[PDB]
Symmetry: C2
Subunit: 80 residues, 2 copies
């Protein structure tokens, strides 16, 4: 269908993001995962890509960068 996959974040973001929300990563994290294995952005991913806030998405992607650096702090203390 290339469009019935973004429905999940379309029903979860009913009232929140544009208002404030908290994490707002659930959407980026999901599409990013698929974007890391096959990059199959359904229709909603693109149509919603240019109709959200960006300030929160870009900040979220920035937090993901800090979250990945933290993962290294986890795989860098194994000692052996």
């Amino acid at each position: 269908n290339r469009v019935s996959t973004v429905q999940q974040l379309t029903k979860r973001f009913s009232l929140g993001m544009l208002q404030g929300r908290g994490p707002l990563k659930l959407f980026m994290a999901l599409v990013a995962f698929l974007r890391f294995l096959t990059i199959p952005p359904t229709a909603g991913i693109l149509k919603r890509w240019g109709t959200i806030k960006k300030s929160k998405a870009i900040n979220v992607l920035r937090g993901f960068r800090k979250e990945i650096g933290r993962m290294l702090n986890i795989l860098n203390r194994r000692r052996r």
Copy 2:
């Protein structure tokens, strides 16, 4: 169970990774996603955390950093 979730990458990494594989992100991407929403690393995630290669995982996490920067190149060209 806190252990029957890593089984998926345990059956997919049967013969590869230590040999060469290709992406080897499927594992980090999955645990990373959960690590971005609730950080529920099952038993395997930890026991396997200190018994893999790290050079490939760290390189994978580095590729994820380049993949996220690319996502911005996508959410920075919307114009409006």
